[PDB]
Amino acid sequence: LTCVKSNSIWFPTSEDCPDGQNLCFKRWQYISPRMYDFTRGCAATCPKPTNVRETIRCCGTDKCNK
């Protein structure tokens, strides 16, 4: 699998996931209206929110987390 990788520093790029990681994730954290922190990458299992302002979506096709 290949996923989009991005975070607060790095602009979105393609990344090849390690063998055995067959999900891509997109995670967003609400700050205020229409203002979010986004993170994207590969995962083995879908990550879970660390706080109630976070939402995560996972998917299983190349770069589906764009």
Author numbering: 1 to 66
Quote the study that presented this structure, word for word.
The three-finger toxin (3FT) family is widely represented as structural motif, mainly in the Elapidae snake venoms, supporting various biological functions. This fold is characterized by three adjacent loops rich in β-pleated sheets emerging from a small globular core containing four invariant disulfide bridges. Despite high primary structure identity, often greater than 55%, muscarinic and adrenergic toxins exhibit distinct pharmacological profiles and clear functional differences. “Loop grafting” has been used to construct seven chimeric toxins to dissect how the affinity, selectivity and functionality for the muscarinic and adrenergic receptors depend on shuffling loops between various toxins.
Three chimeras were obtained by substituting loops of the MT7 toxin with the corresponding loop from the MT1. These chimeras were named MT7-1/1, MT7-1/2 and MT7-1/3, numbered for the respective grafted MT1 loop. The comparison of loop 3 from each of the two molecules in the asymmetric unit of MT7-1/3 compared to MT1 shows again an excellent match. The comparison of loop 2 from chain A of MT7-1/3 with loop 2 of MT1 shows that the replacement of loop 3 of MT7 for that of MT1 imposes a reorientation of the side chains to match that of MT1 although there is poor sequence identity. The situation with loop 3 is different because of the conserved interaction between loop 2 and the second strand of loop 3. To preserve the interaction we have observed that the side chain orientations on the top part of loop 2 tend to conform to those from the parent toxin. Indeed, in chimera MT7-1/3 the side chains on loop 2 execute a concerted rotation and adopt conformers that match closely those on MT1 loop 2. By least-squares fit we have an rmsd for MT1 vs MT7-1/3 of 2.87±0.08 Å while by SSM the value falls to an rmsd of 0.89 Å on 61 aligned residues with a 79% sequence identity. While loop 1 transfer has no significant effect on the toxin affinity for hM4, a moderate gain of function (5-fold) is observed with the grafting of loop 3. Notably, a two orders of magnitude increase in affinity for the α1A-adrenoceptor is achieved for chimeras MT7-1/1 and MT7-1/3 by the grafting of loop 1 or 3.
